[PDB]
Design a protein around this ligand. Sequence first.
Ligand SMILES: [Fe+3]
Ligand SMILES: [Fe+3]
Ligand SMILES: [Fe+3]
Ligand SMILES: [Fe+3]
Ligand SMILES: [Hg+2]
Ligand SMILES: [Hg+2]
Ligand SMILES: [Hg+2]
Ligand SMILES: [Hg+2]
Ligand SMILES: [Hg+2]
Ligand SMILES: [Hg+2]
Ligand SMILES: [Hg+2]
Ligand SMILES: [Hg+2]
Lengths: 340, 340
Amino acid sequence: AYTTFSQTKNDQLKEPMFFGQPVNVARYDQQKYDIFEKLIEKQLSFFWRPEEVDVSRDRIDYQALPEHEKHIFISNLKYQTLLDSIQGRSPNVALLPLISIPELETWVETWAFSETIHSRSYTHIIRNIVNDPSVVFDDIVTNEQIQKRAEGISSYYDELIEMTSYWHLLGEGTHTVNGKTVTVSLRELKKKLYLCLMSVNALEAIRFYVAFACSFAFAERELMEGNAKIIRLIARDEALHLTGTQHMLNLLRSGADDPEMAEIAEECKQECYDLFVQAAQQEKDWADYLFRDGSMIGLNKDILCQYVEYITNIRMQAVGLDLPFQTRSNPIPWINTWLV
Amino acid sequence: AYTTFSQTKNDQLKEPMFFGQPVNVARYDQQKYDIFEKLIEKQLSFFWRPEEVDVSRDRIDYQALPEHEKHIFISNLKYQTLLDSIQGRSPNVALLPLISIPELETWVETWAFSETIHSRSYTHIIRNIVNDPSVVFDDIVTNEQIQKRAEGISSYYDELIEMTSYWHLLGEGTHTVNGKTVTVSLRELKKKLYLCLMSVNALEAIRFYVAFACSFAFAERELMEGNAKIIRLIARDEALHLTGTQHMLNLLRSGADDPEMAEIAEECKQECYDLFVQAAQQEKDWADYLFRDGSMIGLNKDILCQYVEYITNIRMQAVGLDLPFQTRSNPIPWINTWLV
Ligand SMILES: [Fe+3]
Ligand SMILES: [Fe+3]
Ligand SMILES: [Fe+3]
Ligand SMILES: [Fe+3]
Ligand SMILES: [Hg+2]
Ligand SMILES: [Hg+2]
Ligand SMILES: [Hg+2]
Ligand SMILES: [Hg+2]
Ligand SMILES: [Hg+2]
Ligand SMILES: [Hg+2]
Ligand SMILES: [Hg+2]
Ligand SMILES: [Hg+2]
């Protein structure tokens, strides 16, 4: 059963990252994995407030944009809002109840908080460019293409949370709930956590990239420069997040943490592969919806597509997976000046 | 029946603060209660890092304190570490799954985040004054004197968490679970939230204050000044947190947010009064503890206790509870030079 302050005096240095005794004393004088303490310090050094980025000229530039280019900017904004909305609460609600080491507990919390800063920045941009934000915010949940092309995300979290609840209440075994047989197994829960983690990783590694590239393309035609400065900050935060999920996944893979997680990573390898491939496809589909009731001059659905492939391969290899796409060179190296 | 992104387009202004549809889109262009957005704003403007306050000279001051003064300083730090260890994690684990308005959702992740900074600050202090932090950190979990408070506080959050889990897993009704009858009633669930929210108010309202007082007592004496600087940053954050729980409680009690909550607030009165008083008495016994070995210069058990009584009456009144102690002027006006 979960407790906010476990009463057993435990050596936190020997607990696994997940499924061990809930964290009791939050101390930062020692760590099982210093990478997490490093990441917290770095995120705290990058603290920024949106409020401090002038975006007044952007309302002018935006007003002057062709409808087709406006739809691209708005749509991306709507998409980033969906993601960061989910990224703000999810790590806290889904992982926090499973963490067993303090450095990771605090990291998750610092990471989810920085996502809320991102959310706030969208509000800042939006209310500075459109005379009524509700048009944008109200077409999110309903936008059939955002929900369609971003199908699967709440899914991994939602099932994990439900499973976690059953396990925290009932414990392992086969039970009878309202006449129904329900089986609770930790190994299964670990698979659910592992794949959730691999999906967050995909989200962090690839999902923002086509948005960033659009935003940045605008900045290269010398337009939407305040937005661009914000996206620059956001991207720098996402790089830390990703570095943090890659490490978690890789440490889990090495078998140096919980040994059962090393068997699970291996047996799930094919699903890891498929979800990444599914995500790439989703981004590619997004690429069309954007390059729809028109397009752009400097970029197009094919260029986007090449880039999504370019990036997905880099990212999959970082986590030890096989490459699904043909190897190519970055198709828009100009993005590199704005990145990380 | 909890999701990280509800698919129903809903009017977020019309939703209650808790137990409504889970929050989908995080937008901050509008709010049902401006207070929570204001709170997020101040807390961000107050951002600070413990690392930038120099604690080095505090080493010689602590080393030179009389032994029983070292016990007071340390026990206090231990107690503060306990409270903030619970406060970094809890609000997120306990409230997030029940919030239905975005501003509240965000404020709760910002609030909890600022508390991780407080715990980080206690390691910074501890690290800089003793040689082995493990001596401090390993005597909190099982230290008898601290322990009682921990159990009392955790309890409220824990029962709330468990009932929330059954609620979201099975919904209301009389259910069977392995031969056992289990009744789930939202009325009762509301009752448990009100009470845990009441105990956190007492926690922010009064339990930290007595620790502050002792910290500030040394500062008045020109001792342990780095610590005193950090504690001043901490008490400034605490004032905002309390402002939050006070507002939440008052909104609930007035029936303005959820009519049923006004009924629950009245049914619950005596017990809220009993809990605040119980909290106050622990602080007193805690003071009697601290000063068993003799007063520190400038502060003593009796004054402290008068101080608890004085602050309690204030806090209580603020949340419409009867005053349990005889009215008095603040017995240690000098604390105001350090608080706000
Ligand atoms: Fe983000
Ligand atoms: Fe992120
Ligand atoms: Fe605090
Ligand atoms: Fe606090
Ligand atoms: Hg996850
Ligand atoms: Hg996930
Ligand atoms: Hg699997
Ligand atoms: Hg894998
Ligand atoms: Hg509580
Ligand atoms: Hg609470
Ligand atoms: Hg003291
Ligand atoms: Hg009550």
